[PDB]
Amino acid sequence: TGDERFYAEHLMPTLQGLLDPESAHRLAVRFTSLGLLPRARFQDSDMLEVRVLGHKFRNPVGIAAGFDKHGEAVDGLYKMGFGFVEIGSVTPKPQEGNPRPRVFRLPEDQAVINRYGFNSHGLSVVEHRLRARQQKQAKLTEDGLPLGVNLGKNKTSVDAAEDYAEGVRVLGPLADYLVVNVSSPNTAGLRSLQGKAELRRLLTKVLQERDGLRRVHRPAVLVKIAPDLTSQDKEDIASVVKELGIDGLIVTNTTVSRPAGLQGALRSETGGLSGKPLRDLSTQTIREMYALTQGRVPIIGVGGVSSGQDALEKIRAGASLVQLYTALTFWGPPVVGKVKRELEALLKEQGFGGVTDAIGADHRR
Ligand SMILES: Cc1cc2nc3c(=O)[nH]c(=O)nc-3n(C[C@H](O)[C@H](O)[C@H](O)COP(=O)(O)O)c2cc1C
Ligand SMILES: Cc1nc(Cl)sc1C(=O)Nc1ccc2ccccc2c1
Ligand SMILES: O=C(O)c1cc(=O)[nH]c(=O)[nH]1
């Protein structure tokens, strides 16, 4: 499409050449929140509809956590064409995150490295922001456009489990699903919460708090995991998920690895790497987690999705829904319709009646 080309070849490179990545992001969030977006001409066909997590999703392509950290651009994101929106991570108290600069573009690799460290307006601010549009969201969700809330923990928190529990109590009633983010590489000690005993204890508390919410305000609970886990880690996560009845998994967060072949000058910056070099590592993690959970636990696949083929590979590997973030940084808003259009075409070409038929298809061949 003309829009795709204009954004890819002209607008985005100009934006990028004029502003550092954090400023560019702040501006993108502002424009999104004002609905200043190119025409999402793409109409979602029935083939793209998915029913999972106790909800209908008009299409399976969502915006990943981190773009709208504080819940400021939710409606603009649906307008962009996303079938669902996840905000966060939100921490219990407000916090500034790491010192700048803390995000870096690797254009030669179509990758980003970030070390934001959970900059967050905090639960109270986000709660009021979501309450101000709560009934509009109730109608969106009913219409097949659900909202997810991703929870983090404060840097100085003594008790991680209580941080997450507070998030469940405060934002749980405003969310269709909650994400327990235990996979940020930018908060010290956080990833150790993926370990079997820590995870079991943490998630038992989270699920207890969730179950204590009134029925119409009771969200699904998902756990978002790293792409850098050992086989033992993945086995243990699968075991805990099945033991506790966790509703789903988000696979994956950014990687602390630096795959061979990265060309960007900034490849050795500390932080999580996202984008294209993450793609197949993420897809393989989805494939493994789907097998370990016997295809019975919904997976949202995320990491390096920039095309319909990327989306479909994750869906065939076992993802019921997919998310993207970094591709937006390079291709802008037209990438969303592009992914949906290509995905629909590929589903038809490969003989699937719809997205639902393709979920986990690789494991049945
Ligand atoms: C700048 C930036 C900030 C992010 N912040 C969060 C976050 O706060 N919580 C979270 O769970 N994931 C966060 N992520 C990870 C994304 O949600 C996603 O898992 C990861 O970037 C891989 O997807 P992608 O390759 O499409 O970007 C962030 C990613 C980036 C690039
Ligand atoms: C389309 C448009 N009209 C005016 Cl005026 S400014 C503007 C505009 O620049 N919109 C953008 C550009 C890039 C983006 C990247 C990510 C997310 C949202 C984005 C919105
Ligand atoms: O805030 C962060 O730095 C952040 C959190 C997260 O979950 N993933 C990431 O790449 N960065």
mmCIF file of C-alpha atoms in Angstrom, residues 163-336:
data_model
loop_
_atom_site.group_PDB
_atom_site.id
_atom_site.type_symbol
_atom_site.label_atom_id
_atom_site.label_comp_id
_atom_site.label_asym_id
_atom_site.label_seq_id
_atom_site.Cartn_x
_atom_site.Cartn_y
_atom_site.Cartn_z
ATOM 1 C CA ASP A 163 3.463 -5.647 44.776
ATOM 2 C CA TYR A 164 1.733 -7.971 42.324
ATOM 3 C CA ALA A 165 -1.148 -8.603 44.717
ATOM 4 C CA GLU A 166 -1.756 -4.829 45.021
ATOM 5 C CA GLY A 167 -1.840 -4.628 41.230
ATOM 6 C CA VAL A 168 -4.436 -7.390 41.064
ATOM 7 C CA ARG A 169 -6.626 -5.649 43.629
ATOM 8 C CA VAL A 170 -6.350 -2.187 42.069
ATOM 9 C CA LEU A 171 -6.305 -2.853 38.305
ATOM 10 C CA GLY A 172 -7.773 -6.358 38.154
ATOM 11 C CA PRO A 173 -11.333 -5.036 38.220
ATOM 12 C CA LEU A 174 -10.598 -2.861 35.160
ATOM 13 C CA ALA A 175 -8.935 -5.549 33.052
ATOM 14 C CA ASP A 176 -10.048 -8.396 30.831
ATOM 15 C CA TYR A 177 -6.726 -10.030 31.585
ATOM 16 C CA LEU A 178 -3.828 -9.352 33.896
ATOM 17 C CA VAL A 179 -0.210 -10.167 33.153
ATOM 18 C CA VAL A 180 2.234 -11.036 35.865
ATOM 19 C CA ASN A 181 5.440 -9.740 34.350
ATOM 20 C CA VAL A 182 8.296 -11.751 35.841
ATOM 21 C CA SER A 183 10.553 -11.464 32.800
ATOM 22 C CA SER A 184 11.823 -7.875 32.582
ATOM 23 C CA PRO A 185 15.588 -7.989 32.257
ATOM 24 C CA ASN A 186 15.798 -4.438 33.648
ATOM 25 C CA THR A 187 14.778 -4.935 37.279
ATOM 26 C CA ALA A 188 17.322 -6.656 39.543
ATOM 27 C CA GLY A 189 16.252 -10.078 40.786
ATOM 28 C CA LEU A 190 12.956 -10.004 38.861
ATOM 29 C CA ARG A 191 13.693 -12.911 36.514
ATOM 30 C CA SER A 192 14.454 -15.203 39.470
ATOM 31 C CA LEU A 193 10.687 -15.093 40.141
ATOM 32 C CA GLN A 194 10.388 -17.495 37.174
ATOM 33 C CA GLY A 195 12.059 -20.186 39.309
ATOM 34 C CA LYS A 196 9.734 -22.989 40.392
ATOM 35 C CA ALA A 197 9.327 -22.338 44.136
ATOM 36 C CA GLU A 198 9.268 -18.533 43.853
ATOM 37 C CA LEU A 199 6.818 -18.710 40.957
ATOM 38 C CA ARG A 200 4.476 -21.113 42.723
ATOM 39 C CA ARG A 201 4.365 -18.943 45.828
ATOM 40 C CA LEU A 202 3.911 -15.734 43.849
ATOM 41 C CA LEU A 203 1.175 -17.082 41.587
ATOM 42 C CA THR A 204 -0.730 -18.758 44.424
ATOM 43 C CA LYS A 205 -1.048 -15.341 46.075
ATOM 44 C CA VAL A 206 -1.920 -13.602 42.800
ATOM 45 C CA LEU A 207 -4.643 -16.141 42.003
ATOM 46 C CA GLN A 208 -6.046 -15.953 45.543
ATOM 47 C CA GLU A 209 -6.378 -12.169 45.176
ATOM 48 C CA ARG A 210 -7.894 -12.506 41.719
ATOM 49 C CA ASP A 211 -10.442 -15.067 42.901
ATOM 50 C CA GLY A 212 -11.494 -12.627 45.639
ATOM 51 C CA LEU A 213 -12.769 -10.120 43.062
ATOM 52 C CA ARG A 214 -16.469 -9.947 42.179
ATOM 53 C CA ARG A 215 -17.369 -12.121 39.196
ATOM 54 C CA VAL A 216 -17.924 -9.505 36.506
ATOM 55 C CA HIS A 217 -14.629 -7.887 37.560
ATOM 56 C CA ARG A 218 -12.556 -11.076 37.642
ATOM 57 C CA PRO A 219 -9.797 -11.079 34.975
ATOM 58 C CA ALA A 220 -7.884 -13.960 33.404
ATOM 59 C CA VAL A 221 -4.323 -14.170 34.774
ATOM 60 C CA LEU A 222 -1.352 -14.724 32.451
ATOM 61 C CA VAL A 223 2.366 -14.964 33.145
ATOM 62 C CA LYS A 224 4.848 -13.308 30.804
ATOM 63 C CA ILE A 225 8.106 -15.186 30.471
ATOM 64 C CA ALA A 226 11.615 -14.618 29.157
ATOM 65 C CA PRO A 227 13.109 -16.017 25.934
ATOM 66 C CA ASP A 228 16.334 -16.897 27.795
ATOM 67 C CA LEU A 229 15.043 -19.723 29.982
ATOM 68 C CA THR A 230 16.783 -23.050 30.406
ATOM 69 C CA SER A 231 14.956 -26.250 29.509
ATOM 70 C CA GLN A 232 14.615 -26.881 33.260
ATOM 71 C CA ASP A 233 13.019 -23.432 33.757
ATOM 72 C CA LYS A 234 10.473 -24.031 30.997
ATOM 73 C CA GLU A 235 9.602 -27.505 32.360
ATOM 74 C CA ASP A 236 9.072 -25.991 35.836
ATOM 75 C CA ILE A 237 6.942 -23.116 34.532
ATOM 76 C CA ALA A 238 4.766 -25.551 32.601
ATOM 77 C CA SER A 239 4.396 -27.666 35.740
ATOM 78 C CA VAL A 240 3.370 -24.703 37.948
ATOM 79 C CA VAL A 241 0.962 -23.377 35.328
ATOM 80 C CA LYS A 242 -0.815 -26.715 35.232
ATOM 81 C CA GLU A 243 -0.717 -27.156 39.018
ATOM 82 C CA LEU A 244 -2.286 -23.723 39.683
ATOM 83 C CA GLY A 245 -4.631 -23.406 36.705
ATOM 84 C CA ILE A 246 -2.977 -20.249 35.325
ATOM 85 C CA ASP A 247 -5.073 -18.982 32.429
ATOM 86 C CA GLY A 248 -2.310 -18.348 29.908
ATOM 87 C CA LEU A 249 1.236 -17.358 29.042
ATOM 88 C CA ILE A 250 2.792 -14.440 27.244
ATOM 89 C CA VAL A 251 5.842 -15.639 25.328
ATOM 90 C CA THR A 252 8.187 -13.760 25.254
ATOM 91 C CA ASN A 253 9.672 -10.624 26.798
ATOM 92 C CA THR A 254 12.957 -9.173 25.444
ATOM 93 C CA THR A 255 16.243 -11.117 25.416
ATOM 94 C CA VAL A 256 19.440 -10.388 27.348
ATOM 95 C CA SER A 257 21.250 -12.455 24.748
ATOM 96 C CA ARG A 258 22.982 -10.844 21.791
ATOM 97 C CA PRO A 259 22.638 -13.238 18.850
ATOM 98 C CA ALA A 260 25.671 -13.557 16.583
ATOM 99 C CA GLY A 261 25.374 -11.310 13.562
ATOM 100 C CA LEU A 262 24.018 -8.104 15.135
ATOM 101 C CA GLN A 263 25.383 -5.161 13.128
ATOM 102 C CA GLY A 264 24.058 -2.112 14.986
ATOM 103 C CA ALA A 265 26.668 0.144 16.580
ATOM 104 C CA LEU A 266 24.702 0.003 19.835
ATOM 105 C CA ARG A 267 24.566 -3.816 20.075
ATOM 106 C CA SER A 268 26.571 -3.889 23.305
ATOM 107 C CA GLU A 269 24.283 -1.568 25.268
ATOM 108 C CA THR A 270 22.853 -3.146 28.408
ATOM 109 C CA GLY A 271 19.155 -4.030 28.196
ATOM 110 C CA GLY A 272 16.553 -6.247 26.595
ATOM 111 C CA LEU A 273 16.766 -6.747 22.846
ATOM 112 C CA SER A 274 13.544 -6.811 20.791
ATOM 113 C CA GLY A 275 12.608 -6.919 17.129
ATOM 114 C CA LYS A 276 13.756 -9.191 14.338
ATOM 115 C CA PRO A 277 16.742 -10.835 16.075
ATOM 116 C CA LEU A 278 14.288 -11.990 18.778
ATOM 117 C CA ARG A 279 11.773 -13.516 16.361
ATOM 118 C CA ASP A 280 12.811 -17.139 16.038
ATOM 119 C CA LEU A 281 13.978 -17.424 19.657
ATOM 120 C CA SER A 282 10.458 -16.344 20.667
ATOM 121 C CA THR A 283 8.754 -18.657 18.193
ATOM 122 C CA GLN A 284 10.772 -21.614 19.481
ATOM 123 C CA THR A 285 9.834 -20.771 23.078
ATOM 124 C CA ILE A 286 6.149 -20.738 22.078
ATOM 125 C CA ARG A 287 6.589 -24.085 20.371
ATOM 126 C CA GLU A 288 8.171 -25.590 23.488
ATOM 127 C CA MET A 289 5.646 -24.104 25.971
ATOM 128 C CA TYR A 290 2.691 -25.231 23.836
ATOM 129 C CA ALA A 291 4.058 -28.794 23.814
ATOM 130 C CA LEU A 292 4.816 -28.767 27.560
ATOM 131 C CA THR A 293 1.266 -27.590 28.326
ATOM 132 C CA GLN A 294 -0.277 -30.074 25.887
ATOM 133 C CA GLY A 295 -1.891 -27.268 23.904
ATOM 134 C CA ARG A 296 -4.300 -26.648 26.789
ATOM 135 C CA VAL A 297 -2.940 -23.281 27.938
ATOM 136 C CA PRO A 298 -3.529 -20.227 25.717
ATOM 137 C CA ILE A 299 -0.363 -18.495 24.542
ATOM 138 C CA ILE A 300 0.058 -14.918 23.392
ATOM 139 C CA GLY A 301 3.109 -14.963 21.145
ATOM 140 C CA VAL A 302 5.281 -11.895 20.944
ATOM 141 C CA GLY A 303 8.767 -11.086 19.695
ATOM 142 C CA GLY A 304 9.849 -9.786 16.310
ATOM 143 C CA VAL A 305 6.485 -9.903 14.543
ATOM 144 C CA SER A 306 6.511 -7.540 11.538
ATOM 145 C CA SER A 307 4.545 -9.452 8.905
ATOM 146 C CA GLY A 308 1.675 -11.841 8.345
ATOM 147 C CA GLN A 309 4.188 -14.667 7.934
ATOM 148 C CA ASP A 310 5.768 -13.879 11.326
ATOM 149 C CA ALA A 311 2.317 -13.879 12.907
ATOM 150 C CA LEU A 312 1.274 -17.153 11.288
ATOM 151 C CA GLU A 313 4.495 -18.921 12.279
ATOM 152 C CA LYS A 314 3.821 -18.084 15.928
ATOM 153 C CA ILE A 315 0.167 -19.129 15.599
ATOM 154 C CA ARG A 316 1.139 -22.458 14.010
ATOM 155 C CA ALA A 317 3.737 -22.906 16.783
ATOM 156 C CA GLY A 318 0.933 -22.617 19.323
ATOM 157 C CA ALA A 319 0.003 -18.959 19.868
ATOM 158 C CA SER A 320 -3.705 -18.088 20.013
ATOM 159 C CA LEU A 321 -2.978 -14.355 19.780
ATOM 160 C CA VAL A 322 0.127 -12.376 18.850
ATOM 161 C CA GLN A 323 1.457 -8.950 19.820
ATOM 162 C CA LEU A 324 3.981 -6.580 18.343
ATOM 163 C CA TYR A 325 5.812 -3.456 19.471
ATOM 164 C CA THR A 326 9.210 -2.953 17.849
ATOM 165 C CA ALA A 327 7.900 -3.237 14.255
ATOM 166 C CA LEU A 328 5.904 -0.035 14.932
ATOM 167 C CA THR A 329 9.184 1.763 15.618
ATOM 168 C CA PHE A 330 10.383 1.050 12.114
ATOM 169 C CA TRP A 331 7.262 0.820 9.987
ATOM 170 C CA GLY A 332 4.740 2.927 11.872
ATOM 171 C CA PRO A 333 0.956 2.388 12.119
ATOM 172 C CA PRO A 334 0.484 0.888 8.619
ATOM 173 C CA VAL A 335 2.271 -2.265 9.814
ATOM 174 C CA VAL A 336 -0.860 -3.298 11.725
#
